Design a protein around this ligand. Structure first.
Ligand SMILES: *[C@@H]1O[C@H](CO)[C@@H](O)[C@H](O)[C@H]1NC(C)=O
Ligand SMILES: *[C@@H]1O[C@H](CO)[C@@H](O)[C@H](O)[C@H]1NC(C)=O
Ligand SMILES: *[C@@H]1O[C@H](CO)[C@@H](O)[C@H](O)[C@H]1NC(C)=O
Ligand code: NA
Length: 583
């Protein structure tokens, strides 16, 4: 235990701020799956597991290159050994200052240039190779291979370069089926490496790895992979696909208490499927994708620069700069952040195509940061034909001039509308600010287009509110960019639009003042509160055509519930605790 106000219970841990204000302002971050799992440079980061899979291409590749995995195991990648041709193979990165190709300073410079507000390494993957100076795990990068505390190295470089530190931990699945096809051994060390220790010992080692690392580098974000409490994702291994609840609650309490000692608001994450942690104090992470609508509470997306692996492989191909930038814009439009993974080579070199993606991302963010950083999601994420499918493992967004993504400042009086291309007619239509949206733009003081450099704006040529939409005639195209940003400065806050199929709630006796616009869905009190209007302060609800609303006093839509239909309505102050939109 560590001195703090948190005991290892759910009710104490649930008081932790899941997503602090800095996290909500950071928007974009970068991490790297680099480790002993990159040494083979074949298939995926899951080569450690698949190299023993019966009848796998990995097993065939391993047998044809190094030998049978029953004789030449992954511990040879860690500790060093010859292949069949006679070449020495080990994850032994050499610092470029000592004559090697591992230049961590160049990598951290590229990451800084990308515009990342949080960065850091993968501290430990499923392979059981701790990349810090561990005492609990002798299978680490200090005692073996490069003999260098890479996690401390990356932490020092990330802090020196003015970025928050995230450390990715994927050691829960190490003993929940990752090495299920590896040969049983009696060696207690290799048992530690291959997840063949008693469950109790393995959960204790999970917690101890977390403690060692979080005390060694004091990370701002703890990124946890699956197998915390994720039944159904550990194949057919005789295991619970979970970490002992006691150990998880003890980890949460330790990390939060150590954070109260450091005076730092910290974040820990869980895959949206893993129910090991709750969104009361933890952040739901969507892998290779994100929600299709605005999802509250605040969330995170972890994506990779490649659709195939998170680690480098000969012949790896990468996504485009547009996909990454457009996907970042959609995620931040829907109350979330983006954590992009890059894939350095086994020798510690970042390939030129990854360097170009990072520099294109950095160009866009250095030019339009005002629109992304320190902004919040609006009540309507965007307009356009191009939308993502929804959920994890979905395709990266690639939009065009017909697609708009909305962001707003914290004071809710500036609206950033980003077009995913340049319209050939130099026109932009914002349907949600039309007259049919019951929006009055009298308070609209200025529409600008962001220029070639930050702080350079050009006034819009002309605009007019039609019933169907707000029409905007664009000024001359600025310097080329993957997207173009319009800044609408209002006076007295951004008007509350009325959806065609949905409704709008306001903390006032009329449709005036602060309000939240809501489309089809279920809106908990957490949702409404994060939107900027606590449900116990609502006094007016305006409904669009045939949109039936179900009102609850529960902050979770549970219990006696009254109902309303289309048309205006006045609710007693405190009667609303939840809202369900239907039909
Ligand atoms: C491991 O222990 C089992 C049980 O005592 C034994 O049958 C097996 O031969 C041992 N293997 C090795 C490599 O020591
Ligand atoms: C989100 O809005 C889209 C608009 O196309 C709608 O189709 C979808 O049903 C809404 N959210 C969900 C999944 O309820
Ligand atoms: C934008 O994409 C949509 C959907 O693919 C397409 O229908 C439309 O023609 C595109 N517009 C432009 C200007 O590329
Ligand atoms: Na909380």
């Amino acid at each position: 235990q560590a001195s703090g106000p948190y005991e290892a219970t759910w009710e104490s841990t649930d008081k932790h701020i899941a997503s602090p204000e800095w996290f909500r302002d950071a928007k974009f971050g970068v991490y790297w799956h680099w480790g002993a799992f990159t040494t083979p440079q074949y298939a995926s980061e899951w080569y450690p597991r698949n190299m023993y899979e019966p009848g796998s291409d990995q097993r065939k590749h391993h047998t044809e290159t190094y030998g049978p995995p029953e004789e030449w195991g992954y511990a040879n990648f860690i500790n060093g050994a010859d292949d069949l041709k006679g070449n020495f193979v080990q994850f032994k990165p050499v610092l470029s200052s000592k004559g090697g190709e591992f230049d961590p300073e160049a990598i951290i410079k590229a990451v800084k240039a990308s515009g990342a507000k949080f960065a850091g390494p993968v501290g430990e993957h499923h392979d059981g190779y701790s990349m810090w100076d561990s005492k609990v795990n002798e299978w680490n990068s200090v005692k073996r291979g490069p003999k260098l505390d890479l996690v401390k190295l990356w932490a020092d470089l990330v802090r020196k370069n003015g970025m928050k530190l995230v450390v990715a931990m994927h050691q829960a699945y190490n003993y929940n089926g990752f090495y299920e096809w590896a040969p049983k051994t009696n060696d207690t060390s290799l048992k530690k490496l291959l997840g063949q220790l008693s469950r109790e010992e393995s959960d204790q080692l999970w917690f101890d790895k977390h403690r060692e690392m979080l005390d060694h580098v004091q990370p701002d974000i703890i990124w946890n992979d699956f197998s915390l409490d994720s039944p159904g994702y550990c194949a057919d291994f005789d295991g619970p696909c979970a970490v002992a609840e006691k150990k998880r609650l003890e980890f949460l309490a330790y990390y939060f208490n150590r954070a109260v000692e450091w005076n730092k608001e910290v974040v820990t994450t869980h895959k949206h499927f893993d129910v090991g942690f709750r969104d009361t104090s933890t952040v739901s992470d969507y892998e290779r994708g994100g929600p299709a609508n605005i999802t509250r509470p605040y969330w995170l997306t972890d994506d990779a620069i490649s659709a195939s692996s998170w680690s480098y492989t000969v012949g790896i191909q990468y996504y485009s700069s547009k996909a990454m930038v457009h996907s970042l814009l959609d995620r931040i439009s829907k109350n979330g952040n983006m954590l992009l993974n890059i894939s350095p080579t086994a020798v510690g070199v970042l390939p030129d195509e990854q360097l170009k993606v990072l520099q294109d991302i950095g160009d866009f963010l250095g030019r339009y940061g005002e629109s992304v950083f320190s902004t919040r999601a609006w009540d309507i994420y965007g307009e356009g034909p191009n939308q993502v499918t929804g959920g994890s493992f979905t395709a990266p967004l690639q939009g065009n001039s017909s697609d708009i993504r909305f962001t707003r400042n914290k004071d809710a009086n500036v609206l950033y509308a980003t077009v995913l291309g340049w319209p050939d007619d130099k026109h932009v239509s914002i349907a949600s600010l039309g007259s049919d949206a019951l929006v009055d733009l009298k308070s609209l003081k200025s529409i600008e287009l962001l220029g070639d450099k930050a702080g350079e704006y050009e006034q819009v040529s002309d605009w007019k509110q039609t019933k169907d939409a707000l029409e905007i005639s664009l000024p001359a195209k600025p310097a080329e960019s993957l997207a173009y940003v319009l800044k609408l400065t209002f006076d007295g806050g951004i008007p509350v639009p009325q959806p065609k199929i949905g409704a709008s709630v306001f903390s006032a006796t009329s449709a005036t003042g602060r309000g939240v616009s809501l489309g089809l869905g279920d809106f908990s009190e957490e949702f409404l509160t994060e939107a900027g209007l606590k449900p116990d302060t609502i006094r007016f609800i305006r409904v669009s055509s045939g949109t039936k609303l179900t009102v609850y006093s529960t902050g979770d839509l549970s219990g006696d519930s009254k109902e309303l239909d289309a048309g205006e309505h006045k609710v007693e102050e405190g009667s609303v605790g939840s809202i369900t939109i239907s039909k």
